[PDB]
């Protein structure tokens, strides 16, 4: 959720660092979907604050 939640060497780099606190949740009754809990983009938040 902070500035640096996703870290890469260059904009064209292959390997990336990621700390976003991603956890999968159980799907709804009779529903095919992948529900998840994840902290929003730190870069998008920083661009505002």
């Amino acid at each position: 959720g902070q500035f640096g939640d996703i870290q890469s060497r260059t904009p064209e780099s292959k390997d990336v660092y990621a700390n976003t606190q991603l956890v999968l949740q159980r799907p709804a009754a009779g529903t095919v979907h992948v529900p998840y809990s994840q902290a929003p983009s730190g870069f998008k938040y920083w661009l505002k604050e």
Binding site: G30, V32, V34
Partner: protein, 98 residues
């Protein structure tokens, strides 16, 4: 960031198993006793003997080439100056490193 999530593996009348993958923020979970529904009815035959494999990982978004912030480490600075000189009744422009 881009949260790359593929199609969930719904195993009808059986159990699915998580494979430990070397990917940034890789998350995996298998949910027991799932009875999912589609357009024409139930996707599975069994009532409680079905499983669903939910796998996910974090990647750099397509925008990273355009929309990005660079983290630099400033060491020392080199000074350089544009100077105007009124030499022999005429203004001259001098651009050099300070």
């Amino acid at each position: 960031y881009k949260t790359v999530i593929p199609s969930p593996y719904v195993k009808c009348c059986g159990t699915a198993e998580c494979k430990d993958k070397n990917l940034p923020d890789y998350s995996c979970k298998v949910f027991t006793g799932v009875y999912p529904f589609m357009w024409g009815g139930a996707y599975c035959f069994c009532d409680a003997e079905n499983t669903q494999l939910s796998e996910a990982h974090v990647e750099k978004s397509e925008s990273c080439k355009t929309e990005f912030a660079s983290a630099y480490r400033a060491h020392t600075a080199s000074a350089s100056a544009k100077l105007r000189v009124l030499y022999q009744g005429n203004n001259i422009t001098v651009t050099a490193y300070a």
